């Protein structure tokens, strides 16, 4: 059964991006997916995405711009304190110069760079670069 | 030796042990 | 897919985006609830009460007109059956198989299906006990199951 809606959303985008598609539909939609997309959008990894209301869970259509190499979830959602962010980046990111790990913290969903600035820990949702 | 017949040989050998051990209980 | 098979069917109803009643539907909510109570007293269940309204009264969805589901309306009037409808039908099927199986001891296919039906009864009964729709001590007994249904 559907266990992680975030995994389906990111897996669909990653497959579509490699195939060279311009648009991709994500179903079901969730506020976790939307916030994850916003983090990618702010860093210029996706274009404009639109949420469609179907009275059940909604759907999202995401415009791709070809800048996204890979995006995936980390399951299970391990706890990550501020001191342990450095270890995770050395494992999941191509280098120490680009790529973001998305964390869910008490202050909201944000990338690891923002988490260090606010000095807040949390759990890993995924990554992209 | 064909595996089927080697299996048959071992099963025969187990009967003799079974009968040779129950001879003294 | 299916709980107790390899089927992967997706056929189902597709509710419209418009939750409000059609402009051509003139029956008011009090009238609809009166009919629902009237049908319930005749022995009909929530599943087949809605079918009559859709096919004979033009009421596609009771919630659109009344704002509440059929079962909720019956409960407010004290007409909800003690055993939920879906659990009731599973018990009836199990009784039918057992009655057939007593005369057919070599029908191993029926014996296989009886296990599936009864296991489905226990899973559903467990859920209702947690939600307090059944008595806390309620238990399904093959010996006395036939007395409950029918």
């Amino acid at each position: 059964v559907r266990v992680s809606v975030l995994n389906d959303a990111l897996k669909s985008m990653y497959n579509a991006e490699k195939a060279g598609k311009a648009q991709v539909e994500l179903r079901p939609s969730s506020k976790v997916i939307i916030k994850f997309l916003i983090v990618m959008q702010k860093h210029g990894y996706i274009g404009d995405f639109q949420y469609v209301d179907d009275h059940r869970v909604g759907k999202i259509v995401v415009e791709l711009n070809g800048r996204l190499n890979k995006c995936g979830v980390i399951s299970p959602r391990f706890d990550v304190g501020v001191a342990t962010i450095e270890g995770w980046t050395a494992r999941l990111l191509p280098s120490r110069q680009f790529g973001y790990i998305v964390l869910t913290t008490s202050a909201g969903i944000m990338d690891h760079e923002e988490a260090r600035r606010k000095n807040v820990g949390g759990k890993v949702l995924g990554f992209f670069y | 030796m064909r595996a089927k017949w080697k299996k048959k040989r071992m099963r025969r050998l187990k009967r003799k042990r079974r009968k040779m051990r129950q001879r003294s209980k | 897919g299916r709980m107790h098979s390899r089927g992967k069917g997706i056929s189902a109803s597709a509710l419209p985006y418009k939750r409000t009643p059609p402009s051509w539907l003139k029956i008011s909510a009090p009238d609809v609830e009166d009919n629902i109570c009237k049908f319930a007293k005749k022995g009909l269940t929530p599943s087949q009460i809605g079918v009559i309204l859709r096919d004979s009264h033009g009421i596609a969805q009771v919630k659109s007109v009344t704002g509440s589901k059929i079962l909720r309306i019956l409960k407010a009037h004290g007409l909800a059956p003690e055993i939920p409808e879906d659990l009731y039908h599973l018990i009836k099927k199990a009784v039918a198989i057992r009655k057939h199986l007593e005369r057919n001891r070599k029908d191993k296919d029926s014996k296989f299906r009886l296990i599936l039906v009864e296991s489905r009864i226990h899973r559903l009964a467990r859920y209702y006990k947690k939600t307090k729709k059944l008595p806390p001590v309620w238990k399904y007994e093959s010996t006395t199951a036939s007395t409950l249904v029918a």
Binding site: S75, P76, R77, F78 | - | -
Partner: protein, 141 residues
Amino acid sequence: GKTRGMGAGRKLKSHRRRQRWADKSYKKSHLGNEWKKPFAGSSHAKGIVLEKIGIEAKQPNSAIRKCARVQLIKNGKKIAAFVPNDGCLNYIEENDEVLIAGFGRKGHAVGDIPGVRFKVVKVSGVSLLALFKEKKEKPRS
């Protein structure tokens, strides 16, 4: 595939515990059968030379490997110890105290010598290497 649940800590730990036994190296040390070996977990051991024997070299080689049956003093077990170097068997006499060591493969046979896993290091308290190089002589005669 692998169990991934955040609450699956017990299953992963218990699964690995069972599967480590499938590893031959792990099972050899944790079985406890090492103490039943003639050395009983020791690097060396002293023994008494029972007789001087020769063992046919395994094929495709052809030779007579000079060995010596030795009874270990500490437990009385009899083993075959290879005598290395050329003409060193002449330095070994029956009913003599010899220090024995492993053959280098941790209880496994070495080279073309069949079923031999020990070698002689000392004879009568003198290393065979010293005798071979004429550094020392056996204490007798």
